[PDB]
Structure formats: structure tokens, C-alpha cells
């Protein structure tokens, strides 16, 4: 009811299914991994509801997979029966503040049992801390919020490939079994008119030797395979016969250099595949191989069998022979056809639970090897579960995962939308998967399967284009790791209010309709002709009652970020892609305002994001305050929520949280109490909405730059807080300890004016470049006073003391008011890393206003740098005196092919000035009246779903019927344009101009962070050239193409200076600085240092690289 603020909806079709919990992907996966009360609760709920679900947890499963250790005598066994957790010792805010990984204890009961002793000894053992996940899907590790992103991988199973070889002039067919963990096997057919096997691609071999090595004899082999001539030819050309002969031959081929041994070869073959540990095919692997090969109920979990290998062989030859339908081996009839790897039925997401489970599995395998070694080197009756197990591997693996991994990525807290879009990404890059180098054309390209499973619009535009994509809005994860999507049920031409979840393979069989298809007054189709899609991504139509499934909501195919854009359908795919990528960089402002025109879904995106603070009880607020808010449920429990205030996010932006609820207002469960960064009344607000007019203006908005009023600078409309945090540590060196003191040496008196007693900058003291934040002094150093220093000290009677200044100073080019300081002391109860006696962190916070050079951008991928901020008067103002808040070049929109922004501007103007439509008897008027969006007051927001937006007819009609804002006249003509009076000249512009309200965002590509200059600064060490980066005064790199261009000019002396004087020559740099300061002419360049580095290096490869002159030896 009161969940969200009122937002007029222009939607035309009702949505049966509601959007799920948008963060389900992480929270449910980790719930399953922990196997805590929540996972089992969902398991029993599904079981009583009849829905399938894995009823075994994640941790307990990996423990159970470890069988009790058996020595060579097999006397002994350890049982890891039951695992349990305890509440974590540190609070979440606590862990964030003192930099502790948010973890909890993990115990398990180890039972020792020996047949020789015939006794059972049970004891509980603690495996280590376990990095736990907070309720908002983040791992607070070392004080930094990480997030583990899913990973796309090729599912284990069998994959058949068809190709054409130009040399052979004939098709070539291959098969590959990709295991979950074990070594890989391939089966190529008719490579050169015979079939052969690749056992890890070790050597050339035939199929007949493999079959003979198995117990299957030649007679039954040809009996089963006498119907295909190719395999008969392979059999007859194979001279070797007998199981022993084939086995010894293959053993010799695989491991040459030793005589063949029957038992050794059989054990090797059993070990490589049939052993359950080395070839542990995941449950998904067997689940899919049984369906593909058609085998009716094979072993639920286990290794490939000889029957499976023969079935794959028969499948391959059936495929090659051209037959398209054949009886499955020990199974029903099945289609035999090549399978494309890129199909989303073959692609599996390794959700966070599975990744952490795999790392725990590796750690436990190391633990198993360690305990086996200990058992082999330990005496009986002195063996206890407490003593034998080493917990170092598990902790050292789960710790080396969350740090130093591609999938455990630093959270980007630019705004709640960026949070969600980081949570839902499916990074195809990672260990054991498609790397950046391995990328091809096929993987990046969209597939017809990516519909409701992976947003095709949004993705990084960098070199990793398409490899990383966001999960669709309605996506859900199959327990095997595939992605499902919801579809409604259709029967006898009547779409029903029932939903089924379809994976990427089940979707193929049925024919799926389109949600946009209209429906009659009755539940039946209004039109016999209806658009449909079917196998292979075909889009052909099928009139009448023939479909069974239709999309439940038209926004199935679009992720959250792309779903936010209004009027998406009118934009090109490229500009919508750029607009989705950009919307994840808008920084929060001082005061946030929800879009006047936007999707109807921003409420859900804001709410399910963890930034917002919502109530867990339905009561009455008793005390509302900026820092905290107290609520009292009717039961009696009192709960106070603490609102974070100006706490630095990961991106150095404020997370100030406002308060919306009054004192005595009633509350409901899940209702919103306090906004987050870039939010308003629980509605997402990534920026402000400005009055935009489209016109070129004196060329200051040339090439897509932007002109905006000084009104925005004046009223702080676009202003953002930025909090930087830099820290210094009082460490002890071999000379002595470091002191944090106000008594810094060789300084003036006034520099240390605002410092505190112990040498810390006070709170609330504005700083600038060079200001002293905390005063630190080196213990001492061997000082050999130079003769000039000696004389000067004697003259002035000053004592140059061994203690040397090393205080922290604000880096160059900075400004801000300090807001907080934190001190941690070794001698105090607080703990610190070794050596560091004290550590001090200071927050410096400024209010960056919108200025020139700042990067601004809208929702539809139209971005530009500010080029000028005219005064309020220079703005071409409207008929009622309102200046336009921003000018944008029209030339962008035709070529950029994103006329959605023009639509948005017109509808924003419409939203700003209300409209009244009653009894007009017009078609659009009837649609508005039935929808309920007829009588709209000025100012209220309006909603246009991403693919059920307002038709242009609606916009035209409402433009005709806008509310008169003043005097009874409408400033915008029916065309949607208005008369603009040039502010500077004063005369009206020759023709009307398009104006309205457009939602702009302030990107994080701020100029202040990009700016960087360098006279002279730090130099590298191994090669004396200047070093790179902004934080270290880094000179820009004069790449190869720069020297090419300079050569093209014929400019040689500039090149000489830019290569020798301006870097890479130690002698010349001091000389040129001295000559410039003294005014003397620049001296002659010498030789560069990198050349001497190279000649020394090629001297150390035993190449006597000698520099010689024409007349004997040269002078250098």
C-alpha cells in the first residue's frame, strides 16, 4: 500500500508476477553454502510445496565427501559427522572499523575409530575462522567490502563438434568429454577416414586398441558395430588383437621407457578415470550426460563407465553417418546432432557458494594429504583428532581466495545501482575459464538464448566487451547452476495465471510467445495472428491457438541498470549500452531528487539495495533524530537504527543517510525509514533533473560539450561531498622508534598552529596543499654535516639534530575540512601489525561543486564535459522568465540515433506541468482514463516502463492539454517546442526551440582527480626515467607514436631534449635545472641511462657489445 511514493503509471499491461528479491543470487547461494537455518527452511518449504531442491547443504556435503582416512593397514578411521557455527565475536560495524574479516567460528565433531583398539573417541575440532557474508551480500574483509561475482563456465559433460577441413574436402566430426576436475578425453571420427581417441592428446592411437584393452571382445564389438562400415574398416585394419596385447601397447605408448606391466597399466587406467576422486564429475555433469546420451537413470553421482564410453562412440558414429534419429544406448530414441558450445544450456554460473565451496574443498584436500602423511609417521594410541589435523590449509586457502583473486572484486559503492550491478554481474573471466586472451568472436556475441538470462544491452565497453554481463531482471539459478526464467502457461489459446521456470534447454522444445502481444477482454488472444519465437532463435509467426508459454513481463530481457532507462525502446542498442554503463557512475549529491520521468522499477532497485535502512517491525516511531531512529513494535521490543553519517565509501564519496518518517507515523514491515546515498523517499535518485533546451550556443557546446547555468553552482543543485582518507603509522626501525609529536624539527612556528597536543590536526580545521596533518619525526640517522651546513649552523647557532622530519602532509592539489581522526596505539588494548607502534587516520572532506571540465551525462548515453557556466542572465529564458538550466547540442541526437532523449525531455516537461483529461472522448484520452493516469497535478512524478512506455500519441495529446502554468497560456506549442528569448542579445530566437526536463547525472570522472602536472619529481630506480601515476608526481609517457610524429615533422632537437634532457639522463637533469634557474643556456645533452642499462644487460648475455669510433676506440 504505502510501500513507495505515488508515481503515475503509463503502463498498459498488468504484470502477474512481481520482481523477485533482486539480490537473491548472492544471499541464497551463500545460505545454501552455510547450510544454516535459512537454507534448510527453504528446502523443507520446497519439499512440502513439491519443488525440487538440493536437500544436502554445501559444507556438510564437502565434509561427507571426505571419507574417513584409511592407512595401508586400514585399521583407523576419522568421521567428520556434524558441523556447527557459533555467533561471531565482532560486530559488523566493529569489524569494518578495526579492520577484521567478518567471520564466525566453525566447529565439527571428529570421531576416531580403530579396529585394533575397538574403541570410539569423539572430540570437537575447530577448523578456523570462516569469512561470513552480511545480509546485503558483501564480505567485509580487512575493513573493505568485497563482493564475489558469479563466473560463467562450460558445464562438464560431452560436447560434439562439426567442422569442415579445406584439405580433406569433407566434414570432420569431433567429441570431447570435459570433466569437472579430472583429465580430459577426446574422440575424433573420420579424421582421415578412421576414428581415433585422444587420451590427453598424448599420442596417435586408434579406437580398436582401447576397446580391446577393455574386457569387451572383438566378436561382440563387430556384432554391435557391424552396421557401420567405417568402424568395421577400423577394426580390420587394426592388426593387434587380445586384451593383454592392446593393454600393453597403450601402456607403452602412454608411458614409454619402461617394460609394459599388466597390473600397473590396469591400475593406471582405473586411476585416471574410474577412480571416484580423480574424475569427480559434478552432479550437473552426470545430470546432463544422462539427458544428452539418453541413458535412462544411470548412477546419480559417479564416474563415466565403459557403457558411457561405448554410448558416446555409437553417438559419434551415428552423427557422422548422417542419420539424425537413432535408438539411444540403453535408452529411448534420441536425435543425434552437433551441439554448439555457446548455447546457454551449456553455460553455468559458479555462484558465490560454489566458488567458496571449491576453495574449501582444495584446502580440505591439502588437509587430507597432511593427515595421511602424519598417520604414516605416527604411533598408535598417541593419535587424537585434536592433534592430527592441521587447520592451516583450509584457512590459508579461504584467505588466499578472498584476497588475490579475480572473482573477489572490490565493491564499487558509487551508488546503490552500482552496488546491485556489481552483485549481479557474471564475470566470464577467471581461473579455469575463458581468459582475456582466449576470447574470440563467438563468445562475446549475443545468442538467441540470452533472453531473460543475461542482459545483452549492458556490458563493459572495454576490451572485455560482452565477456561480462548482468543477470536479467527475472533470472533465477537452477540448482545445477543453469539460469531459469519465468514463463506463463497457455492452454487452448487461453493464457493462464500459472508460472513455470524454464532453463536454456527446456525453452527450446516449446514455442514461446511475446509479452507485448495484445490480449482480448476475455483471457483469450484478441488477434489470431501473434508473434512467437521458437527453436534456434527463429522469430516466425504462428496464428491461432498453438503456443504454450509466453513472457510474463516485457522487461524480462533487460537487467536492472538498463531497465532504469525510460523510453529505452526508441534508443539504439549502442547508446542504451553506454547509458547503462554510465548510470553506474553517478555520484550521490547533497540533496537527491527522484526522477520526474523514469521507469516504475527504481523503487525496487533502491529498496532491495542494502544502502537503504528499512524497518524489521511494524510499530510506531518514538524518537527521530539525525544520528539514530528508535521504533517500538506493538509486542514491546524497542529497536534503534543507527544511521551512518558522512562515512567514506570505497570510492571516496559520502554515504549520508536522511530521515523521512515523522514522530507518530505508523510503520509496516519492510517500510523505508531512512534514505541512502543517491535516494529519495526510497526511490533511486542518481542525479537531478534540469530544464534542457536543444540549441547550438556560440560554440561553447561544440562537439557535445555542455552549457549549464550558474544557477547550479549557486543553488548547489549539482554538488557532491568527497571524503579522502590517508593514514600514517609510527613504526620502529633499527635506529629506534618513530614519534608522533607536535615537536617536529626544522620547521617554523605557525605551520604547527592547528595541531593537537600529541601532534594531530584538530577536527574542523581547513587544510591546503602542504598542511601538516600529523607530525612525525624519524628516530635518528647518521648525519655527516656538510662543510657548508657546518659553517651555516655555526653562524646561526642552530643545532642540526639527528631527528629528521617525516611528517604526513596533504598531497599536492587538495583542499578540505577535516571531519574525523582515528588513533590506534600499540601499548593500548588495540592490536596492530608487528612494528607499527601507532597508526593515525584522518578524514578530509570537501564539497565539490559542479565546475568547468566536470563530466556530466544523461541516461541515454549522451555525455559531455562542462565547457562554460554562463551567469543566470545569459541563459536563453522562456516566455515566463524561467532560464533554461542546461543547453545541449542538437547535432548529437540524429547521428547518435537515440531520439529517446527527446521523448524523455517532452515527457519531463509534461510531468512538471500537470494535465487534466476528462470527457475528451479521444483514443489517447480513453487510454489514459482507463489506465488511471488522467488527472495529474503539477510536479508529481510519472512512470513509463522500459518496454510499455507512453506512445507518442499520448505525448502529443497531453501537450495539447497541459495545465496553464500562468495567465492561462501554455508556453510549449503543440509541436513540443517553445519561444526562447536570447538572454544576451535579447531578441527572440527566430524559430521555436525544443525544451523540457531531462535527468542528468554527475559522473565520477571529475576534473580535479584527472588534473596532474610535473616540473620534476620522483624518479624510478632500475632505470632512472621518471615514474608513472598521479599519486607520485608522474610525468606523462612519450610513447612510440609520439616520437614517430615528431620525426614526421622533421623536428630532431625537440626529440633529443625530450629523450635525454627531460628524462633518462642523471647528469643532464641537474644541469638543465641549474641552467634554467641561473638563466644560462641549456647545456649539450649526454648519453641516456637506459642505453647503458641495455649495453650492460647485453654484456651479461656474453655478447661483447662494444662502442667503437671510426678512428679506433671512442670517447664517451
Amino acid at each position: 500500500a504505502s510501500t513507495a511514493p505515488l508515481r503515475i503509471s503509463f503502463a498498459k499491461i498488468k504484470e502477474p508476477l512481481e520482481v523477485p528479491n533482486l539480490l537473491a543470487l548472492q544471499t541464497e547461494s551463500f545460505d545454501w553454502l552455510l547450510g544454516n537455518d535459512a537454507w534448510k527452511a527453504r528446502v523443507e518449504s520446497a519439499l512440502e510445496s513439491g519443488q525440487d531442491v538440493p536437500t544436502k547443504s554445501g559444507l556438510e556435503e564437502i565434509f561427507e565427501e571426505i571419507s574417513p582416512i584409511e592407512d595401508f593397514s586400514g585399521s583407523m578411521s576419522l568421521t567428520f559427522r556434524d558441523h556447527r557455527f557459533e555467533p561471531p565475536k565482532n560486530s559488523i560495524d566493529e569489524c569494518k572499523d578495526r579492520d577484521f574479516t567478518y567471520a564466525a567460528p566453525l566447529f565439527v565433531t571428529a570421531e576416531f575409530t580403530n579396529n585394533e583398539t575397538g574403541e570410539i573417541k569423539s572430540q570437537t575440532v575447530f577448523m578456523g575462522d570462516f569469512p561470513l557474508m552480511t545480509n546485503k551480500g558483501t564480505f567485509v574483509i580487512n575493513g573493505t567490502e568485497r563482493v564475489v561475482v558469479s563466473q560463467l563456465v562450460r558445464s562438464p559433460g560431452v560436447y560434439f563438434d562439426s567442422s569442415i577441413d579445406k584439405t580433406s574436402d569433407k566434414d570432420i566430426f569431433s567429441a570431447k568429454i570435459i570433466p569437472s576436475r579430472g583429465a580430459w578425453l577426446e574422440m575424433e571420427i573420420d579424421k582421415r577416414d578412421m576414428v581415433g581417441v585422444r587420451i590427453d592428446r598424448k599420442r596417435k592411437q586408434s579406437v580398436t586398441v582401447l576397446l580391446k584393452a577393455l574386457g569387451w571382445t572383438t566378436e561382440q564389438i563387430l556384432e554391435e558395430f557391424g552396421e557401420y562400415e567405417s568402424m568395421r574398416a577400423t577394426l580390420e585394419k587394426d592388426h593387434t588383437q587380445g586384451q593383454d596385447d592392446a593393454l600393453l601397447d597403450i601402456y607403452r605408448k602412454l608411458r614409454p621407457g619402461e617394460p609394459p606391466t599388466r597390473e600397473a597399466a590396469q591400475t593406471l587406467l582405473e586411476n585416471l578415470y574410474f577412480n571416484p576422486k580423480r574424475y569427480d564429475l559434478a552432479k550437473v555433469g552426470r545430470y546432463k550426460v544422462n539427458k544428452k546420451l539418453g541413458a535412462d537413470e544411470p548412477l546419480d553421482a559417479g564416474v563415466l563407465t565403459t557403457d558411457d564410453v561405448i554410448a558416446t562412440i555409437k553417438y559419434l558414429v551415428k552423427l557422422h553417418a548422417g542419420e539424425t534419429e537413432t535408438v539411444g544406448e540403453s535408452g529411448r530414441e534420441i536425435v543425434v546432432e552437433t551441439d554448439d558450445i555457446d548455447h546457454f544450456g551449456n553455460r553455468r554460473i559458479r555462484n558465490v557458494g560454489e566458488l567458496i565451496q571449491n576453495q574449501v574443498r582444495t584446502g580440505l584436500a591439502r588437509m587430507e594429504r597432511v593427515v595421511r602423511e602424519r598417520m604414516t609417521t605416527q604411533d598408535v594410541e598417541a593419535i587424537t583428532p585434536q592433534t592430527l589435523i592441521n587447520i592451516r590449509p583450509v584457512v590459508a586457502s579461504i584467505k588466499e581466495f578472498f584476497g588475490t583473486s579475480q572473482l573477489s572484486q572490490f565493491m564499487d559503492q558509487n551508488n546503490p545501482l552500482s552496488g546491485l550491478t556489481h552483485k549481479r554481474r557474471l564475470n566470464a573471466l577467471g581461473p579455469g575459464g575463458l581468459s582475456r586472451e582466449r576470447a574470440g568472436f563467438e563468445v562475446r556475441d549475443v545468442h538467441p538464448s540470452h533472453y531473460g538470462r543475461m542482459c545483452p544491452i549492458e556490458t563493459p565497453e572495454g576490451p572485455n566487451i560482452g565477456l561480462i554481463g548482468s543477470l536479467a531482471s527475472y533470472g533465477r539459478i537452477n540448482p545445477f547452476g543453469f539460469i531459469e526464467t519465468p514463463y506463463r502457461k497457455v492452454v487452448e489459446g487461453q493464457v493462464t495465471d500459472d508460472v513455470d521456470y524454464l532453463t536454456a534447454d527446456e525453452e527450446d522444445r516449446f514455442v514461446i510467445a511475446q509479452a507485448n502481444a495484445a490480449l482480448g477482454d476475455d483471457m483469450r488472444f484478441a488477434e489470431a495472428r501473434v508473434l512467437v519465437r521458437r527453436r534456434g532463435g527463429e522469430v516466425d509467426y504462428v496464428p491461432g491457438d498453438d503456443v504454450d508459454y509466453m513472457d510474463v513481463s516485457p522487461r524480462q530481457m533487460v537487467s536492472v541498470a538498463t531497465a532504469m532507462i525510460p523510453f529505452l525502446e526508441h534508443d539504439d542498442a549502442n547508446r542504451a549500452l553506454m547509458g547503462a554503463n554510465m548510470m553506474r557512475q553517478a555520484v550521490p549529491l547533497i540533496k537527491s531528487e527522484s526522477p520526474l520521468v523514469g521507469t516504475g522499477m527504481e523503487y525496487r532497485s533502491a529498496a532491495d539495495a542494502g544502502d537503504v535502512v528499512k524497518a524489521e517491525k511494524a510499530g510506531v516511531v518514538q524518537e527521530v533524530s539525525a544520528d539514530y531512529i528508535t521504533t517500538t513494535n506493538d509486542d514491546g521490543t524497542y529497536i534503534t537504527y543507527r544511521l551512518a553519517k558522512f562515512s567514506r565509501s570505497n570510492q571516496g564519496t559520502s554515504v549520508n543517510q536522511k530521515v523521512i518518517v515523522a514522530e507518530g507515523d505508523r510503520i509496516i514491515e519492510g517500510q523505508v525509514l531512512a534514505d541512502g546515498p543517491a535516494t529519495e523517499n526510497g526511490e533511486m535518485a542518481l542525479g537531478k533533473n534540469l530544464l534542457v533546451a536543444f540549441m547550438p550556443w556560440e560554440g561553447h557546446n561544440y562537439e557535445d560539450a555542455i552549457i549549464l547555468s550558474q544557477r547550479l553552482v549557486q543553488d548547489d543543485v549539482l554538488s557532491s561531498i568527497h571524503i579522502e582518507e590517508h593514514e600514517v603509522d609510527a613504526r620502529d626501525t633499527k635506529l629506534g622508534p618513530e614519534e608522533i609529536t607536535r615537536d617536529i624539527p626544522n620547521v617554523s612556528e605557525e605551520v604547527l598552529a592547528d595541531l593537537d597536543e600529541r601532534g594531530i590536526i584538530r577536527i574542523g580545521a581547513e587544510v591546503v596543499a602542504g598542511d601538516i596533518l600529523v607530525g612525525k619525526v624519524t628516530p635518528k640517522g647518521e648525519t655527516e654535516l656538510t662543510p657548508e651546513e657546518r659553517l651555516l649552523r655555526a653562524i646561526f647557532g642552530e643545532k642540526a639534530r639527528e631527528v629528521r622530519d617525516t611528517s604526513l602532509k596533504v598531497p599536492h592539489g587538495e583542499i578540505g575540512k577535516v571531519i574525523g581522526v582515528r588513533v590506534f596505539d600499540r601499548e593500548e588494548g588495540d592490536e596492530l601489525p608487528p612494528g607499527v607502534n601507532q597508526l593515525v587516520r584522518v578524514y578530509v572532506a570537501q564539497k565539490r561543486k559542479i565546475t568547468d571540465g566536470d563530466k556530466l551525462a544523461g541516461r541515454h548515453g549522451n555525455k559531455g564535459v562542462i565547457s562554460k557556466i554562463n551567469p543566470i542572465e545569459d541563459m536563453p529564458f522562456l516566455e515566463d522568465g524561467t532560464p533554461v538550466d542546461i543547453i545541449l547540442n542538437p547535432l548529437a541526437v540524429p547521428s547518435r540515433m537515440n531520439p529517446g532523449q527527446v521523448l524523455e525531455i517532452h515527457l519531463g516537461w509534461l510531468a512538471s506541468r500537470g494535465w487534466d483529461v476528462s470527457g475528451l472522448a479521444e483514443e489517447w484520452a480513453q487510454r489514459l482514463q482507463v489506465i488511471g493516469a488522467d488527472k495529474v497535478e503539477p510536479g508529481t512524478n510519472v512512470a513509463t516502463p522500459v518496454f510499455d512506455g507512453a506512445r507518442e500519441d499520448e505525448l502529443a495529446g497531453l501537450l495539447q492539454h497541459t495545465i496553464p502554468n500562468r495567465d492561462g497560456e501554455r508556453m510549449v506549442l503543440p509541436s513540443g517546442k517553445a519561444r526562447l528569448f536570447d538572454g544576451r542579445s535579447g531578441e527572440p530566437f527566430p524559430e521555436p526551440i525544443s525544451v523540457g526536463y531531462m535527468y542528468i547525472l554527475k559522473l565520477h570522472h571529475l576534473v580535479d582527480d584527472k588534473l596532474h602536472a610535473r616540473s620534476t619529481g620522483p624518479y624510478s630506480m632500475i632505470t632512472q626515467q621518471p615514474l608513472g601515476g598521479k599519486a607520485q608526481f608522474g610525468g606523462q609517457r612519450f610513447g612510440e607514436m609520439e616520437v614517430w610524429a615528431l620525426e614526421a615533422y622533421g623536428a630532431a632537437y625537440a626529440l633529443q631534449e625530450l629523450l635525454t634532457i627531460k628524462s633518462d639522463d642523471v647528469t643532464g637533469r641537474v644541469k638543465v635545472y641549474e641552467a634554467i634557474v641561473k638563466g644560462e643556456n641549456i647545456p649539450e645533452p649526454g648519453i641516456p641511462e637506459s642505453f647503458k642499462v641495455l649495453i650492460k644487460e647485453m654484456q651479461s648475455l656474453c655478447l661483447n657489445v662494444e662502442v667503437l669510433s671510426s678512428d679506433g676506440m671512442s670517447i664517451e
Binding site: 567460528p105 575447530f126 585434536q386 592433534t387 592441521n390 587447520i391 592451516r392 582475456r436 626544522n746 662543510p787 657548508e788 657546518r790 659553517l791 651555516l792 655555526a794 653562524i795 646561526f796 647557532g797 642552530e798 608487528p834 612494528g835 620534476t1016 620522483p1018 624518479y1019 624510478s1020 630506480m1021 632500475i1022 632512472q1024 615514474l1027 608513472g1028 601515476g1029 607520485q1032 642523471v1066 637533469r1069 641537474v1070 638543465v1072 635545472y1073 641549474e1074 634557474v1077 641561473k1078
Partner: protein, 176 residues
Amino acid sequence: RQAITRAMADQARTIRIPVHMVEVINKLARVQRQMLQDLGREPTPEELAKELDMTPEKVIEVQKYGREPISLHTPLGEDGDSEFGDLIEDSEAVVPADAVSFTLLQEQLHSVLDTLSEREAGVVSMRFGLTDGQPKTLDEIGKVYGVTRERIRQIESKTMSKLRHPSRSQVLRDYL
């Protein structure tokens, strides 16, 4: 085992640790692992100190001595943005600002000394080694110049006074 352990101690770590230090570090490491196993928590330094029977200072010393270097030529964090050996600055590089400031100081000081009388400037120069890196004691000056140790002391004192006048102090004050 003797040879393997000895040579593992003497040739495994980049910074050669003496054998007694190797056994001390490995002993404290294994016992610390043990106490982590029993207590299930990170032991406090004092408990470790009393376990090893040595003082906490030795505990910290060996704990810091038992580290390993990190390779410069490692991925710095991005795809290919150089390595860890291309982000840390050196100390031996002569900051050209410092060099030019020092040369200007030398020039100004030499000019100010030239302002003084020849013998006075000379004696102060030898007293502070402005011609040579080794300054000469008062008596040490009274051999090439032919003045008594107390006489050269006296004129050195008068030079110190003269240069301390506000006249020849405005320029040199600003160089510290």
C-alpha cells in the same frame, strides 16, 4: 635429514638467516601453530613470549626477521600496467631542486666570505672546510698560516661575530 635441514636453512631464503636463528624462528612458528590449534584463536604476544621463555622483544625481533621478499616483477594489479618494480621511488636520485639550491647556497656563502677580509675569510673557510671536505681545527689552521692556536681561535671568534651581524645574515637566513 641433517644435510637436508642444514642446507634448507642455509640456502632457502633470499636473506641468509643463521642456523640458530632458523631453528629459533621455526620453533616459535610451530609452537604458535600449536597454540592456535588449542586456543582456536590468535595468541597474544605475552603468552607467546612466556611459551618460548624469551622476552617479548625477542619475539617481535624474530617475527620480523622471519619474512620473505616480494618480487618486483609481479603483476601490479591491472592487466599489463608494468610491475611492482615501476611504482616505488628511489632515494639516491639527486632532486634537482635540492642540487640547484645547494649550489646557490655555495655561491652566496662564497660571496659573503669574500665580503670579509682575506685572512678572516680564509681562516673561517679552513675552520669549516669550504675549500676541502675536511675542516681544520684551530691549531690545525695555525701551521700553514703561521698563527698561534689561541690567536687563530681569536680571529675565528671575531669572524663568527662579524658574520653574525645583521648585515651578512639576511641572505643566508633564508637558506637555513
